[PDB]
Motif scaffolding. Sequence first.
Motif, PDB file in Angstrom:
ATOM      1  N   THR D  13      -0.141  15.070  22.075  1.00  0.00           N
ATOM      2  CA  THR D  13       0.158  16.225  21.236  1.00  0.00           C
ATOM      3  C   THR D  13      -0.981  16.494  20.266  1.00  0.00           C
ATOM      4  N   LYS D  14      -1.719  15.448  19.893  1.00  0.00           N
ATOM      5  CA  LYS D  14      -2.876  15.600  19.022  1.00  0.00           C
ATOM      6  C   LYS D  14      -3.950  16.473  19.654  1.00  0.00           C
ATOM      7  N   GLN D  16      -6.332  19.049  20.554  1.00  0.00           N
ATOM      8  CA  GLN D  16      -6.681  20.321  19.927  1.00  0.00           C
ATOM      9  C   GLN D  16      -7.118  21.285  21.024  1.00  0.00           C
ATOM     10  N   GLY D  45      -2.178  24.695  12.907  1.00  0.00           N
ATOM     11  CA  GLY D  45      -1.509  23.499  13.363  1.00  0.00           C
ATOM     12  C   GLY D  45      -0.901  23.718  14.730  1.00  0.00           C
ATOM     13  N   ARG D  53       4.420  25.404  23.488  1.00  0.00           N
ATOM     14  CA  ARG D  53       5.767  25.409  24.043  1.00  0.00           C
ATOM     15  C   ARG D  53       6.774  25.881  23.007  1.00  0.00           C
ATOM     16  N   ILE D  67       6.726  21.321  29.497  1.00  0.00           N
ATOM     17  CA  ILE D  67       5.685  20.332  29.732  1.00  0.00           C
ATOM     18  C   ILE D  67       6.100  19.455  30.900  1.00  0.00           C
TER      19      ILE D  67
END
Lengths: 52, 52, 99, 104
Positions: D13-14, D16, D45, D53, D67
């Motif tokens: 999830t980090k 970028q 963010g 999503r 996902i």
Amino acid sequence: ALEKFQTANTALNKADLFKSTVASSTTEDLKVSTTAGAAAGTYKINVTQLAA
Amino acid sequence: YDSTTNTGNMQELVKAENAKLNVNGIDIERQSNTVTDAPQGITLTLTKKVTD
Amino acid sequence: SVDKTNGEVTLAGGATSPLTGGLPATATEDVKNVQVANADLTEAKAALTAAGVTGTASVVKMSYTDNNGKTIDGGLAVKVGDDYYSATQNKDGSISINT
Amino acid sequence: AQSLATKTTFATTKEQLGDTSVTSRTIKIEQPGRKEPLEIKLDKGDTSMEAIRDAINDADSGIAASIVKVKENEFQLVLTANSGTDNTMKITVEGDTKLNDLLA
């Protein structure tokens, strides 16, 4: 009585309810199920081996 | 016994292997006969080889 | 011509002439008192000096980042070296350190 | 019902997925049966697949995102349609050129 009402309302308050869904397989060999947020639609699967 | 060399006075009866499959042309591998991410929310119980 | 020393207002440089139009569109709002720039940060400077800290105020808007790289911004803070005092800006643009 | 998945895969999830420089990226949608294009505006963010999503699904615009876990420690992104050729889609990112490359 108040505790019963709290139980019911607390259960209802969750938003997952508004994303409810149900699914079915075209074959008996595979079982399926859904949780909250499951994307509606149709999918196709292939199988090459079972885990051991 | 030694997995790396398969040596030892024991005897391997059933080899260890991982579940292997594909979804809509998307190759996937999982470590058991239950999957909970392909797609997200959907869950499968697999016991046989079936195509499409 | 505004003499801020005691708030006394005189004719601009003594130029003895009324202007043709004169008032710009940027001046069209009235005032009863002399002004000081919000960027002057007089309030924050005085507050920090009274706290005994060298508050020659320089202000920045803060942003915070986690290991995600996900970023979220805060308000304005007084960058006293690396000692950031939390600050706020009012409706008029004036700046005051949170207390 | 049509659906699309990304060609590339990522892990966290980090991740970028976008350009940190761009203030707030915008995503535009069109369909033959669609009335007007949809827009999605973001904060700094929303660079993550999870952010994408959440935006798409919570928009409640009839287009959903999901996902998929490719392998252990690997993910992919998937889109949803609502059946029928009328819902055929065109997508364009008017912000980060990296996302333009990824999704165009």
